[PDB]
Amino acid sequence: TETVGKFEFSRKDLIGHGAFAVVFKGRHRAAHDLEVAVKCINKKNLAKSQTLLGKEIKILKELKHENIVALYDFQEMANSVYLVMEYCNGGDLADYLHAMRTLSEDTIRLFLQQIAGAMRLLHSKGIIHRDLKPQNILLSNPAGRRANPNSIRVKIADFGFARYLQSNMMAATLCGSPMYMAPEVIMSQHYDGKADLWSIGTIVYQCLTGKAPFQASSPQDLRLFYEKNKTLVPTIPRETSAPLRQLLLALLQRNHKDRMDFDEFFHHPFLDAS
Numbered sequence: 001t002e003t004v005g006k007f008e009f010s011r012k013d014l015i016g017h018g019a020f021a022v023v024f025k026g027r028h029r030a031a032h033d034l035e036v037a038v039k040c041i042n043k044k045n046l047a048k049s050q051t052l053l054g055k056e057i058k059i060l061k062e063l064k065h066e067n068i069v070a071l072y073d074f075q076e077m078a079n080s081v082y083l084v085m086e087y088c089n090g091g092d093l094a095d096y097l098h099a100m101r102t103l104s105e106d107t108i109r110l111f112l113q114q115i116a117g118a119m120r121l122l123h124s125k126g127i128i129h130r131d132l133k134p135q136n137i138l139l140s141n142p143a144g145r146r147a148n149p150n151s152i153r154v155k156i157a158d159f160g161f162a163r164y165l166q167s168n169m170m171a172a173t174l175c176g177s178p179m180y181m182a183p184e185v186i187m188s189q190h191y192d193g194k195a196d197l198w199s200i201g202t203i204v205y206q207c208l209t210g211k212a213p214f215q216a217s218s219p220q221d222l223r224l225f226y227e228k229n230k231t232l233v234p235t236i237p238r239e240t241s242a243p244l245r246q247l248l249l250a251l252l253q254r255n256h257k258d259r260m261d262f263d264e265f266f267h268h269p270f271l272d273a274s
């Protein structure tokens with residue numbers, strides 16, 4: 001077994017992986033019931049995985065929120081870097097959607113309330129995430145892994161692509177998952193924090209209908225569709241409540257200049273308790 005500080009983990013206990021990171025289940029060496037997730041280098045992309053893991057450490061040191069994955073400890077050295085992070089017994093949102101197929105509007109509202117709270121911190125600190133997708137949304141249920149989805153706590157994870165963006169500046173780095181990036185990102189244009197809001201609206205749309213709002217065969221086909229259609233019409237089912245209808249239509253705007261902003265997102269009537 002491998003040790004990182006006061007924690008230990010074993011490979012082949014894989015609970016998550018990406019192109020630039022690998023995640024294993026772990027535990028405190030003294031308190032074995034204390035579960036943690038140890039994030040390590042993906043050896044397939046050694047040099048970049050180191051850099052992205054180091055950047056995530058610097059970002060998460062400043063982002064402490066109940067709906068953001070906690071960073072208990074870390075270990076940066078010349079040739080390796082490790083992150084001892086919060087473990088979530090519910091898994092990621094992608095696995096939950098693969099099992100539930102669709103979520104109730106009340107469940108979406110509960111999830112969106114927590115995401116909006118986390119995004120409120122990111123926005124106030126001037127940080128954009130740039131990799132928001134169900135795989136990077138973690139679920140934690142304190143009443144048991146099979147308890148009521150009304151008591152689920154949601155945590156945003158994977159901050160390796162995150163960056164500070166000054167309020168009068170635009171970003172231009174191409175990162176994230178093509179299905180979830182805003183049109184301006186995939187079309188190689190400048191973008192700001194409103195790109196994350198498109199990703200969130202895409203996630204909310206997927207939780208509602210079980211599918212992505214804008215289908216495509218490949219990333220190149222998706223960007224050609226975004227190019228060809230100067231306006232975007234997301235099909236919203238008839239049973240959708242009116243507050244959720246306006247939230248999705250304003251989040252899934254093609255032009256970021258027309259897209260919903262943060263202040264109107266943080267106080268949207270759909271988030272208001274029913």
Ligand SMILES: O=C(NCC(F)(F)F)c1cc(-c2cnc3[nH]c(C4=CCCNC4)cc3c2)cs1
Pocket residue numbers: 015016017018019020021022023037039069085086087088089090091092136138157158159
């Ligand atoms: O950054 C991250 N992921 C991006 C990338 F690219 F690295 F994958 C992080 C992911 C986690 C984390 C925390 N808790 C977890 N639980 C489970 C369970 C799976 C099935 C059985 N039920 C529980 C998975 C899981 C992952 C911390 S960080």
